[PDB]
Amino acid sequence: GSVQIVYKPVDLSKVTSKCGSLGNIHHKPGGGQVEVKSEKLDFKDRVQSKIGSLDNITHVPGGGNKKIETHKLTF
Amino acid sequence: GSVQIVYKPVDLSKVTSKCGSLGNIHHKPGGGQVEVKSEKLDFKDRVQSKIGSLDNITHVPGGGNKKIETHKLTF
Amino acid sequence: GSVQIVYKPVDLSKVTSKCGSLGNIHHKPGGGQVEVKSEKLDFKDRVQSKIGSLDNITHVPGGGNKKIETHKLTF
Amino acid sequence: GSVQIVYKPVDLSKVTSKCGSLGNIHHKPGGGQVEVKSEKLDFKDRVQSKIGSLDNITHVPGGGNKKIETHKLTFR
Amino acid sequence: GSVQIVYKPVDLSKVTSKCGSLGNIHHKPGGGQVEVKSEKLDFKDRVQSKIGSLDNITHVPGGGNKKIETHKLTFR
Amino acid sequence: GSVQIVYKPVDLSKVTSKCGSLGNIHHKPGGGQVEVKSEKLDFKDRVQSKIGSLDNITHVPGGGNKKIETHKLTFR
């Protein structure tokens, strides 16, 4: 007899990452005044000082996608 | 007799990651005044000083997606 | 007799991760005044000092999705 | 007998709009899947047959104000 | 007897708009999948058969304001 | 007996728009997939058959304002 195979899979799927800060309204972060007085300090070894007032950051190592959709027909 | 195989899977799936500080309204974070005074300090070893007032951060190692969807027909 | 196989699964699934700070209205966090006076301290070993007033953070290692949907027909 | 008509309406109306920004607008429809099986599709008079098509309008006026005003005088 | 008609309507009205920016407008419809199977498609009078088309309009006027005004005097 | 008609309507109205920027407009439709199978397609009178087309309009006037004003005087 005859054989018919009709292999017609359909994909409309929507994998998405929405990461960080994306839809905020009137966000308005404010830093206050900062004062740093330093007279007779002694540092004998390596120094990594940071001074700021507003340190506003969005950092995203994340998000990203893997989509793996493999098809096989064996007769 | 005859054979018919119809292989029409349908995918409409909508998988999503929504991560961090997304849809906020009038967020308005405020730092207060900061004062550091330092006379005669001694440091024999390595220093990682941070001074700020508002340290506003969104950090996202996360979110992100994996979709694995394999299809097989064997006659 | 004749054989018909009609393989028509349908996927409309919506699995989602919602993580961090997503829908706040008039959030308004406020840091107070901060004062740090330091006279004659002695540090013999490594120092990791942090001074702030508002330390507003969203941190998200989490969220994210795995979807695994494998389809097989064997005749 | 005689007729005097004095049609003197006076209009000082305002219709006004102030806007700081019309921002981000994201019109992104999707058709999904549609399947029709038959022996016939058979349409005979004024049929608005609309299988799986999309009709999409984005209208974004910076101000969209309307004033509609009709003055009628009829005499017989 | 006699008829006097004085028709002197006065318009000093304003229709106005002020806008700071029309920003980002994204109009991105997607058609999906459409399938039609038959022995016949058979259309005989004024049929608007619309299988899987996209008909798309973007209309973004810096001000879209309308004044419509009709004056009618009718005499018999 | 006499008729006097004095049709003297006065218009001093304003229709106006101020805009700071017309921004970024991204009209980008995509047609997806359409399939029709049959032994006949058979169209006989005023048929607007429209399989899988894209029809796209982008109207962006720096001001798109309308003043329409109609005067009629009818006398018998």
From Swiss-Prot, chains A, B, C:
Phosphorylation at serine and threonine residues in S-P or T-P motifs by proline-directed protein kinases (PDPK1, CDK1, CDK5, GSK3, MAPK) (only 2-3 sites per protein in interphase, seven-fold increase in mitosis, and in the form associated with paired helical filaments (PHF-tau)), and at serine residues in K-X-G-S motifs by MAP/microtubule affinity-regulating kinase (MARK1, MARK2, MARK3 or MARK4), causing detachment from microtubules, and their disassembly. Phosphorylation decreases with age. Polyubiquitinated. Requires functional TRAF6 and may provoke SQSTM1-dependent degradation by the proteasome. PHF-tau can be modified by three different forms of polyubiquitination. 'Lys-48'-linked polyubiquitination is the major form, 'Lys-6'-linked and 'Lys-11'-linked polyubiquitination also occur. Tau/MAP repeats lie at residues 3-33, 34-65. Expressed in neurons. Isoform PNS-tau is expressed in the peripheral nervous system while the others are expressed in the central nervous system. The tau/MAP repeat binds to tubulin. Type I isoforms contain 3 repeats while type II isoforms contain 4 repeats. Promotes microtubule assembly and stability, and might be involved in the establishment and maintenance of neuronal polarity. The C-terminus binds axonal microtubules while the N-terminus binds neural plasma membrane components, suggesting that tau functions as a linker protein between both. Axonal polarity is predetermined by TAU/MAPT localization (in the neuronal cell) in the domain of the cell body defined by the centrosome. The short isoforms allow plasticity of the cytoskeleton whereas the longer isoforms may preferentially play a role in its stabilization. It is linked to In Alzheimer disease, the neuronal cytoskeleton in the brain is progressively disrupted and replaced by tangles of paired helical filaments (PHF) and straight filaments, mainly composed of hyperphosphorylated forms of TAU (PHF-TAU or AD P-TAU). O-GlcNAcylation is greatly reduced in Alzheimer disease brain cerebral cortex leading to an increase in TAU/MAPT phosphorylations. Frontotemporal dementia 1: A form of dementia characterized by pathologic finding of frontotemporal lobar degeneration, presenile dementia with behavioral changes, deterioration of cognitive capacities and loss of memory. In some cases, parkinsonian symptoms are prominent. Neuropathological changes include frontotemporal atrophy often associated with atrophy of the basal ganglia, substantia nigra, amygdala. In most cases, protein tau deposits are found in glial cells and/or neurons.
Swiss-Prot record, chains D, E, F:
Glycans are attached at residues 44, 50, 66. Phosphorylation at serine and threonine residues in S-P or T-P motifs by proline-directed protein kinases (PDPK1, CDK1, CDK5, GSK3, MAPK) (only 2-3 sites per protein in interphase, seven-fold increase in mitosis, and in the form associated with paired helical filaments (PHF-tau)), and at serine residues in K-X-G-S motifs by MAP/microtubule affinity-regulating kinase (MARK1, MARK2, MARK3 or MARK4), causing detachment from microtubules, and their disassembly. Phosphorylation decreases with age. It is found in: Cytoplasm, Cytosol; Cell membrane; Cytoplasm, Cytoskeleton; Cell projection, Axon. The modification N6-acetyllysine is found at residues 8, 14, 18, 28, 40, 44, 66. There is a cross-link at residues 8, 14, 18, 28, 40, 44, 50, 66, 72 (Glycyl lysine isopeptide (Lys-Gly) (interchain with G-Cter in ubiquitin)). Changing residue 2 to N: In FTD1; minimal parkinsonism; very early age of onset. The modification Omega-N-methylarginine is found at residue 46. The modification Phosphoserine is found at residues 2, 21, 49, 53. Tau/MAP repeats lie at residues 3-33, 34-65. The record marks 8, 14, 18, 28, 37, 40, 67, 72 as: Not glycated. The modification N6,N6-dimethyllysine is found at residue 8. Interacts with MARK1, MARK2, MARK3 and MARK4. Interacts with PSMC2 through SQSTM1. Interacts with SQSTM1 when polyubiquitinated. Interacts with FKBP4. Binds to CSNK1D. Interacts with SGK1. Interacts with PIN1. Interacts with LRRK2. Interacts with LRP1, leading to endocytosis; this interaction is reduced in the presence of LRPAP1/RAP. Promotes microtubule assembly and stability, and might be involved in the establishment and maintenance of neuronal polarity. The C-terminus binds axonal microtubules while the N-terminus binds neural plasma membrane components, suggesting that tau functions as a linker protein between both. Axonal polarity is predetermined by TAU/MAPT localization (in the neuronal cell) in the domain of the cell body defined by the centrosome. The short isoforms allow plasticity of the cytoskeleton whereas the longer isoforms may preferentially play a role in its stabilization. This is Microtubule-associated protein tau. It comes from Homo sapiens (Human). The lineage of its organism: Eukaryota, Metazoa, Chordata, Craniata, Vertebrata. The chain holds residues 621 to 696 of 758 of the full protein.
